Amino acid sequence: VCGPKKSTNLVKNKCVNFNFNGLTGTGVLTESNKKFLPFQQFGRDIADTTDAVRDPQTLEILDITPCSFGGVSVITPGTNTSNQVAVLYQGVNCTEVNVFQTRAGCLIGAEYVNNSYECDIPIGAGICASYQTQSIIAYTMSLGAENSVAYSNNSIAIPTNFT
Amino acid sequence: VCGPKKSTNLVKNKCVNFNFNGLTGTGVLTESNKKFLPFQQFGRDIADT
Amino acid sequence: KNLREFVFKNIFKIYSKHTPINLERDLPQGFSALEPLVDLPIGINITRFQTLLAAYYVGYLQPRTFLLKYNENGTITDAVDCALDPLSETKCTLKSFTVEKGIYQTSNFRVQPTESIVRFPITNLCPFHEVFNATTFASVYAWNRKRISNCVADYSVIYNFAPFFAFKCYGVSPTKLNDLCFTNVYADSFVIRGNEVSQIAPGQTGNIADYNYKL
Amino acid sequence: KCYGVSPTKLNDLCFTNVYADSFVIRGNEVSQIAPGQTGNIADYNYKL
Amino acid sequence: ISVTTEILPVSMTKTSVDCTMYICGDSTECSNLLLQYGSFCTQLKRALTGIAVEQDKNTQEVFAQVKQIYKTPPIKYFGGFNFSQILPDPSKPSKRSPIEDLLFNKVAQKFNGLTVLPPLLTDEMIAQYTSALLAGTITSGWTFGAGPALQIPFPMQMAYRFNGIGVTQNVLYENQKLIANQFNSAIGKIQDSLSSTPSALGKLQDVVNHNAQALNTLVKQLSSKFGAISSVLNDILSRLDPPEAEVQIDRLITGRLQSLQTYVTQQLIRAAEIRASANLAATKMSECVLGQSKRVDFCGKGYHLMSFPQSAPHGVV
Amino acid sequence: KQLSSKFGAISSVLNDILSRLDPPEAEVQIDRLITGRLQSLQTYVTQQLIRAAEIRASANLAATKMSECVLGQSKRVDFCGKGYHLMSFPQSAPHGVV
Amino acid sequence: RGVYYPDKVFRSSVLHSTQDLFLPFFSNVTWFHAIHNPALPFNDGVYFASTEKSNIIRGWIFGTTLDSKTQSLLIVNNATNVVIKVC
Ligand SMILES: *[C@@H]1O[C@H](CO)[C@@H](O)[C@H](O)[C@H]1NC(C)=O
Ligand SMILES: *[C@@H]1O[C@H](CO)[C@@H](O)[C@H](O)[C@H]1NC(C)=O
Numbered sequence: 001v002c003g004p005k006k007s008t009n010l011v012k013n014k015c016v017n018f019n020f021n022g023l024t025g026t027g028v029l030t031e032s033n034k035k036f037l038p039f040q041q042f043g044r045d046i047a048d049t050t051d052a053v054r055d056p057q058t059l060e061i062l063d064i065t066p067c068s069f070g071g072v073s074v075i076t077p078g079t080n081t082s083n084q085v086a087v088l089y090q091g092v093n094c095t096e097v098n099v100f101q102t103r104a105g106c107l108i109g110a111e112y113v114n115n116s117y118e119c120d121i122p123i124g125a126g127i128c129a130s131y132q133t134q135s136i137i138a139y140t141m142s143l144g145a146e147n148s149v150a151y152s153n154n155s156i157a158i159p160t161n162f163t
Numbered sequence: 164v165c166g167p168k169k170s171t172n173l174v175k176n177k178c179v180n181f182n183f184n185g186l187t188g189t190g191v192l193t194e195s196n197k198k199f200l201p202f203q204q205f206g207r208d209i210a211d212t
Numbered sequence: 213k214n215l216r217e218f219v220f221k222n223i224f225k226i227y228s229k230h231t232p233i234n235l236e237r238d239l240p241q242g243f244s245a246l247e248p249l250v251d252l253p254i255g256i257n258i259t260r261f262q263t264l265l266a267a268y269y270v271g272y273l274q275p276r277t278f279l280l281k282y283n284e285n286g287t288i289t290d291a292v293d294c295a296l297d298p299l300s301e302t303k304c305t306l307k308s309f310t311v312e313k314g315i316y317q318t319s320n321f322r323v324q325p326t327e328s329i330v331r332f333p334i335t336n337l338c339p340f341h342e343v344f345n346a347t348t349f350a351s352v353y354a355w356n357r358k359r360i361s362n363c364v365a366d367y368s369v370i371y372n373f374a375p376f377f378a379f380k381c382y383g384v385s386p387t388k389l390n391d392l393c394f395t396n397v398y399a400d401s402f403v404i405r406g407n408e409v410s411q412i413a414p415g416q417t418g419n420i421a422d423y424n425y426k427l
Numbered sequence: 428k429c430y431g432v433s434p435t436k437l438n439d440l441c442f443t444n445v446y447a448d449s450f451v452i453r454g455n456e457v458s459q460i461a462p463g464q465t466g467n468i469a470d471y472n473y474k475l
Numbered sequence: 476i477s478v479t480t481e482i483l484p485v486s487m488t489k490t491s492v493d494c495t496m497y498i499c500g501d502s503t504e505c506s507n508l509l510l511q512y513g514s515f516c517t518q519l520k521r522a523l524t525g526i527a528v529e530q531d532k533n534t535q536e537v538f539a540q541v542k543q544i545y546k547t548p549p550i551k552y553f554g555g556f557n558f559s560q561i562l563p564d565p566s567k568p569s570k571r572s573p574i575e576d577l578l579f580n581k582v583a584q585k586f587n588g589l590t591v592l593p594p595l596l597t598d599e600m601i602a603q604y605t606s607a608l609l610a611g612t613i614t615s616g617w618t619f620g621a622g623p624a625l626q627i628p629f630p631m632q633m634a635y636r637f638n639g640i641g642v643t644q645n646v647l648y649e650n651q652k653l654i655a656n657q658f659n660s661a662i663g664k665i666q667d668s669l670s671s672t673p674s675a676l677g678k679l680q681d682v683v684n685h686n687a688q689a690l691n692t693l694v695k696q697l698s699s700k701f702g703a704i705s706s707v708l709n710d711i712l713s714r715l716d717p718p719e720a721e722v723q724i725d726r727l728i729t730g731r732l733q734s735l736q737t738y739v740t741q742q743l744i745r746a747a748e749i750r751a752s753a754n755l756a757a758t759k760m761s762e763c764v765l766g767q768s769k770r771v772d773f774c775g776k777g778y779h780l781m782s783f784p785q786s787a788p789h790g791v792v
Numbered sequence: 793k794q795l796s797s798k799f800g801a802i803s804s805v806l807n808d809i810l811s812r813l814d815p816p817e818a819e820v821q822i823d824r825l826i827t828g829r830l831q832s833l834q835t836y837v838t839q840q841l842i843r844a845a846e847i848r849a850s851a852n853l854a855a856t857k858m859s860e861c862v863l864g865q866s867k868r869v870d871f872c873g874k875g876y877h878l879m880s881f882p883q884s885a886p887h888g889v890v
Numbered sequence: 891r892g893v894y895y896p897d898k899v900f901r902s903s904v905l906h907s908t909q910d911l912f913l914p915f916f917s918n919v920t921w922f923h924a925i926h927n928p929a930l931p932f933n934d935g936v937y938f939a940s941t942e943k944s945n946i947i948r949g950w951i952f953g954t955t956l957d958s959k960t961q962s963l964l965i966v967n968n969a970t971n972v973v974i975k976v977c
């Protein structure tokens with residue numbers, strides 16, 4: 001028992017509002033391999049969310065994934081130093097939204113540099129950003145200087161002074 | 164638009180109930196050194212009081 | 213140097229703001245705040261604007277959030293728009309015009325919906341010309357229980373009939389009826405006297421409420 | 428009947444503006460001129 | 476010679492919760508009511524950010540004690556002492572020791588505004604820090620902790636450690652082969668002991684489990700009515716008149732605020748516990764690994780000779 | 793600042809509610825204000841207790857360092873500075889020790 | 891330009907956050923030159939600026955239908971007095 005509302009054609013892989021038989025939501029509809037038994041359509045997951053639904057007119061199982069979202073963080077030096085900023089969209093691939101892809105997220109406004117310095121502004125999984133000479137550069141942080149101790153079977157090192 | 168009730172002499176440096184234009188409160192009224200612009204009538208601090 | 217901000221808020225009073233300033237070029241940089249001038253209590257709707265010549269810098273306003281700085285005189289000397297750039301957004305989040313070095317979580321990125329879809333299934337209309345216009349609604353003790361299912365629920369026919377003394381919707385908003393879908397509809401038709409209508413409501417107790425028909 | 432401001436404290440309190448709306452309705456329709464009350468006058472004649 | 480394992484948690488997973496999305500979804504009507512509740516959302520965000528930076532600080536304090544990355548010499552002869560099980564394996568791309576690999580192998584909610592943040596230090600970098608500490612303690616003894624790294628043969632270092640526990644160094648020099656064999660046997664038994672008994676690595680796992688449980692609870696509490704007609708906000712909005720909608724939305728707001736507040740309070744308590752554990756781990760790294768400790772039972776059972784760190788998921792062994 | 797929150801009431805000022813609203817229907821708004829302010833106080837006290845636990849841990853560490861680094865020479869590595877500990881000197885600081 | 895005082899509350903040495911109808915910063919203002927549909931929408935508020943000296947502009951008109959059908963608003967600023975009428 002529904003009301004008067006002319007059905008609109010179905011779309012794929014687009015963040016759209018959906019109203020399926022009173023089920024109102026916003027999401028992306030994708031082809032689903034889930035094998036729904038004939039009973040009904042309101043599929044749900046462990047997170048108590050309507051993960052899937054079967055289209056009423058054409059009986060196909062469509063998975064509903066939430067529209068892409070995340071948190072934005074602003075990497076900035078001191079305001080006196082410069083007004084330039086970098087923006088990190090966390091957990092979001094760069095395709096969704098000076099573009100560099102870190103494991104923490106998509107980092108725009110910063111240039112990646114192969115050379116490694118000590119960490120200045122934390123970004124994520126080993127990536128740190130710094131304002132160096134006049135732009136924000138992102139780099140894999142350096143743990144420290146590499147030192148090799150001259151170890152031999154008969155060699156010792158003894159200090160001759162103190163501080 | 165205020166009302167019948169009348170305008171008692173302003174008592175300063177005493178804990179007195181005050182009703183200023185319908186704003187009621189308790190406290191002491193002291194000479195104020197801050198320079199209001201002609202337009203404001205209320206003053207508030209960083210704590211929103 | 214003749215700034216004039218005019219707003220009309222139904223929170224119905226107009227507000228005018230003005231400030232005169234020394235000027236050597238065109239609209240310069242500076243945070244000269246406009247001091248409100250008049251608050252005329254007019255209450256009629258306005259949707260136009262015109263200037264009488266005896267230059268003309270019209271600029272439309274939108275709902276926004278700002279951060280304003282007050283000096284030791286009660287004067288606004290600086291401001292920040294919290295939707296211009298991410299630096300201004302992090303200034304608003306930190307509530308400070310000077311932002312130290314670091315990474316600041318400011319807002320949330322969301323992908324807005326592009327298109328709206330309805331897929332309601334198909335043709336058969338629900339019987340409403342039977343429940344209404346039946347020429348006999350029986351009695352309150354013997355009221356007709358009509359089951360409505362498997363059809364198009366068109367509530368416009370209800371509005372098509374005579375003006376209603378009491379058209380009260382409790383669980384559902386009356387305007388949003390046609391959007392919603394329902395599992396099963398029950399029609400309960402009867403005839404009762406006028407003064408007892410107020411007692412026929414959920415959560416209300418009364419003699420007619422409890423001995424004739426209790427929702 | 429006073430809804431928002433108590434009848435007793437009208438004299439002490441101060442108000443920014445007063446708006447008077449004068450009309451004529453039947454005796455039983457007076458109760459319809461009140462917040463939360465539904466009726467023909469409330470929806471088609473004058474809405475609070 | 477007895478090699479014992481002590482497993483200490485160091486950090487817990489960093490979580491960020493979006494107040495607006497968790498409590499109001501995508502509706503502005505709900506956000507308008509949420510605004511007048513005050514500054515609860517910013518308080519929760521500040522608490523979670525403090526927890527995240529605290530976890531990063533914990534890992535840095537435990538593992539980044541050394542300032543120079545030391546490398547073991549290519550010729551790995553140390554007077555018959557075999558460190559292959561604790562030294563990194565260049566063949567595997569992880570550059571992790573066999574014990575570290577075993578520990579690593581042994582040990583949606585996102586849709587509602589809950590996110591997990593990556594740790595600042597990668598597992599590769601923590602493994603590199605551990606390898607630097609091992610190289611320093613094998614080639615330099617305890618000298619690299621208290622200053623510049625000083626070369627010393629490993630048998631001489633073990634002789635000095637024997638003198639530390641009140642045993643003359645000839646006891647080492649006339650029993651070097653037996654001592655090396657005992658140490659190698661104990662190191663070999665460590666991997667078997669870790670593999671056989673899962674209760675040893677139960678601490679770290681428990682930590683992870685706890686946080687997971689907490690997150691699940693939050694999501695589950697999104698399904699509670701809290702006295703309202705429905706738990707779905709869009710149903711109320713598209714089903715009700717704005718005033719009754721305000722009432723129901725307010726009920727949901729109260730329920731979800733108390734849910735988040737409980738979550739954040741438990742999270743802060745767990746963060747305090749993890750911080751205490753990380754402080755203990757840092758003290759052990761400074762005293763057991765960077766030197767010889769006279770404190771009884773602090774560094775293993777028996778007279779302490781030395782200690783070796785190993786990275787583990789969210790912990791140190 | 794939590795004193796300025798409406799908490800679902802018409803006004804955040806109790807005097808305004810008393811002057812305007814009638815007792816039977818002003819009681820619910822006063823209850824809204826009461827529950828909001830009580831929740832604010834409870835949040836403050838819980839955060840205060842957690843911060844007090846952190847400060848107590850820091851003070852216990854400071855007392856241990858005063859006993860061992862200052863009133864003696866410590867063989868514990870990195871407990872009293874970096875390097876081989878010779879001695880230590882205490883200095884007072886606002887709400888802390890150096 | 892376009893920043894004003896929201897309400898009559900004195901504040902000293904403070905940063906205050908206001909959600910009000912403001913002119914967005916660094917926005918496109920339409921500069922109009924009048925040489926001697928000429929009407930403009932009101933929307934949520936209007937910002938006017940003028941650099942004139944010899945009182946070339948002397949008032950404004952606000953309204954909905956601009957005729958005798960709907961109430962209008964007329965502001966005239968002569969050399970000695972401002973007159974506002976809502977006839
Ligand atoms: C972007 O990264 C995400 C990470 O979860 C992945 O799921 C997605 O497929 C990636 N897209 C492309 C085109 O790389
Ligand atoms: C001991 O170490 C030295 C390092 O210079 C090496 O030359 C020597 O061969 C080693 N001894 C053995 C038995 O390998």
Ligand SMILES: *[C@@H]1O[C@H](CO)[C@@H](O)[C@H](O)[C@H]1NC(C)=O
Pocket residue numbers: 257258259954
């Ligand atoms: C202005 O208000 C009047 C009366 O409230 C209304 O009829 C009209 O639609 C509104 N809008 C415009 C553009 O006049």
Ligand SMILES: *[C@@H]1O[C@H](CO)[C@@H](O)[C@H](O)[C@H]1NC(C)=O
Pocket residue numbers: 557558559663
């Ligand atoms: C160390 O032990 C491994 C197996 O545990 C063995 O393969 C290796 O040969 C040993 N090292 C030496 C130098 O014998």
